[PDB]
Amino acid sequence: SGFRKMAFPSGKVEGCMVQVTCGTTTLNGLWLDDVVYCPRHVICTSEDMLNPNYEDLLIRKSNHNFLVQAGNVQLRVIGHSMQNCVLKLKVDTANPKTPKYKFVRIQPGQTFSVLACYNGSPSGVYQCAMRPNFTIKGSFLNGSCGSVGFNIDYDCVSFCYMHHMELPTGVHAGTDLEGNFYGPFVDRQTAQAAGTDTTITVNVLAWLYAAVINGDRWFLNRFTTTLNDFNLVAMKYNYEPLTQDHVDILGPLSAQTGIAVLDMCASLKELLQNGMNGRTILGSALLEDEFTPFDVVRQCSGVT
Amino acid sequence: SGFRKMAFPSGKVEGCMVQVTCGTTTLNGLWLDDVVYCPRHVICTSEDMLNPNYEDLLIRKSNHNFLVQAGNVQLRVIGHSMQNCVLKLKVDTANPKTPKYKFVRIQPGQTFSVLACYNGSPSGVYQCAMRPNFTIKGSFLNGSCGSVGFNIDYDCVSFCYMHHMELPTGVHAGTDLEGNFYGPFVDRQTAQAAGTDTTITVNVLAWLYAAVINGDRWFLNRFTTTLNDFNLVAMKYNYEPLTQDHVDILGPLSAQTGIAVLDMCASLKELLQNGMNGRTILGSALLEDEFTPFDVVRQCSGVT
Ligand SMILES: Cc1ccncc1NC(=O)CNC(=O)Cc1cccnc1
Ligand SMILES: Cc1ccncc1NC(=O)CNC(=O)Cc1cccnc1
């Protein structure tokens, strides 16, 4: 028993982190096979970031201008290309620690682990969710760009995020491993304000199920609701609409606990309207939304 | 910017996890050099756990009764001994992935990362704190015993915890790597109730400093207090007393933010007396106490 915000074991990703330097800018790179992936803004100075023309800035760079270091050994760069907002640096050595991997583009509400790195060295691992406004609330300082987000399915690492930007509001923006930003963000130091950070309803419900499985049941009430009635309350509280697809995804948690999804929705509706009244659920005084239904099933069943 | 509950990168510890089976009981072991450390209750059946005589139960076990598997390869056990509540199984092969390591016994209030494992396989990593009542609030299911807690200082892993028990209240108990339980707990399936789970005051203050560094400043007030006045309020709210040693440890955070430790104590005192009023600090509606002052400095400076 017990339920924790849990990241994937990071070892497989640690074996992929490298340091990438271009001129005076140093950030992180991801070494998979004989390619090093990194944010294309490695070629910019902080001044260039105000209004960069990446294609133009890249013409002034050759293979030998990208310095790649894995541990304390230098990798030889034999090619470089820009794919969307990432640079792919072909090196002459395949990463011997390359795990089985995939590049996936996740949907808002999906969670993942981030291995925060500085100078190609891992500092820590934490669990994030892609917010409904396509930002992530991470912990990233100067030099953390190129740190990646991932999920692991047994031995296959699905890379879903690469860190690029910190918006003026202190929230984070980045790309998938094909270099496409999540949301409308751009790799330019300019006014980029985020949209509404709504709560991931399906994740809150999955976490309420985890709370019941772990003995925290005070919030269970004698009511039920419908998707339409629930969604009227959800809109009012800046919660994402719940669809029949979300109800389907919560099916196994409903079956395991004997609590119908719409009954849990009614419990959630009362929590929104009445508040927590100084009480806690799984040690939290707010409704947690960074556990997907799959994460709850995995953690509650011990998936390795 | 941003502040997250962050665990250490777990790779170094993943390379140490093995599966240990004795009869019908399977749990995790920690392989360092040519020794595998595991909870001595691996020799018990669930029935033995009610009132086990470990020395007696151990007489019926030989080296060949301990099955140790690292990945999918079996290790040969050439010796076994009991040290307090852990078994040390000498194997004929030194773990080739043994990191630089130390065995440390931590004090209450200290944080660490847990690599939750099942059948010697890592499932996830999360950050814990040794509670003032010597329990930890982890996420551990059947088969997770032998999972370890650790801190990393650059390349040296300091192992501080090994999982042994889940108390009837769903909180966790375990030992250091010398097999001595933290607190008054025993490896027996019997009534063991935990003491008061007080809040780690020095950790809450360090986290309030992290909140200021990251822009969350609404809670800063126009007051100051003294250690004695603060401690009268702390006692009332089940917060640990704050000592001059804690004030000293918070010195660098006070210097970085220009906020005197006693002023932050006064802010905390008002948060206790007035409540959060529906507001959040670093995305939390309660005062977080599982970040030490050292963790705040590390995360806010990017220590790798
Ligand atoms: C400041 C920050 C913090 C965390 N994560 C990300 C960031 N960075 C940004 O949003 C914007 N980039 C910079 O200001 C620094 C820079 C210079 C030259 C080339 N690339 C980047
Ligand atoms: C039940 C549990 C869950 C999480 N962490 C720990 C535990 N385990 C316990 O507190 C007590 N041990 C058992 O009930 C299981 C067992 C059988 C035979 C030999 N050792 C252990």
UniProtKB/Swiss-Prot annotation, chains A, B:
Residues 1-304 are cytoplasmic. Changing residue 189 to A: Does not affect ability to cleave and inactivate human TRMT1. It catalyses: TSAVLQ-|-SGFRK-NH2 and SGVTFQ-|-GKFKK the two peptides corresponding to the two self-cleavage sites of the SARS 3C-like proteinase are the two most reactive peptide substrates. The enzyme exhibits a strong preference for substrates containing Gln at P1 position and Leu at P2 position. It is found in: Host cytoplasm; Host Golgi apparatus; Host nucleus. Residues 1-304 form the Peptidase C30 domain. Inhibited by pyridone-containing alpha-ketoamides compounds 13a and 13b. In turn, alpha-ketoamide 13b (tert-butyl (1-((S)-1-(((S)-4-(benzylamino)-3,4-dioxo-1-((S)-2-oxopyrrolidin-3-yl)butan-2-yl)amino)-3-cyclopropyl-1-oxopropan-2-yl)-2-oxo-1,2-dihydropyridin-3-yl)carbamate) inhibits SARS-CoV-2 replication in human lung cells. Inhibited ex vivo by michael acceptor inhibitor N3. Inhibited ex vivo by compound 11a and 11b. Changing residue 90 to R: In strain: Beta/B.1.351. There is a cross-link at residues 5, 90 (Glycyl lysine isopeptide (Lys-Gly) (interchain with G-Cter in ubiquitin)). The active site is at 41 (for 3cl-pro activity), 145 (nucleophile). Signal peptide: none annotated. 3CL-PRO exists as monomer and homodimer. Only the homodimer shows catalytic activity. Interacts with host FBXO22; this interaction promotes the proteasomal degradation of nsp5. Cleaves the C-terminus of replicase polyprotein at 11 sites. Recognizes substrates containing the core sequence [ILMVF]-Q-|-[SGACN]. Cleaves and inactivates human TRMT1, preventing tRNA guanine(26)-dimethylation of tRNAs. May cleave human NLRP1 in lung epithelial cells, thereby activating the NLRP1 inflammasome pathway. May cleave human GSDMD, triggering alternative GSDME-mediated epithelial cell death upon activation of the NLRP1 inflammasome, which may enhance the release interleukins 1B, 6, 16 and 18. Also able to bind an ADP-ribose-1''-phosphate (ADRP). This is 3C-like proteinase nsp5. It comes from Severe acute respiratory syndrome coronavirus 2 (2019-nCoV).
